[PDB]
Amino acid sequence: MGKAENYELYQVELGPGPSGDMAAKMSKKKAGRG
């Protein structure tokens, strides 16, 4: 059975980086005191 093969593959097909579009864009936008 499949879990999310078409799920993650769909995200990588939409934006560029898979884990670089949700917490990374918000980490630099609101980092300041890190």
Side-chain angles (χ1 to χ4, degrees):
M1 64 167 81
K3 282 286 181 112
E5 259 131 324
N6 255 235
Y7 168 85
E8 254 205 80
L9 177 105
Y10 193 87
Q11 283 217 252
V12 61
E13 241 181 333
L14 262 304
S19 329
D21 216 64
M22 230 158 165
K25 211 60 241 194
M26 312 264 208
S27 221
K28 239 182 65 132
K29 184 211 286 240
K30 40 180 88 216
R33 222 275 176 90

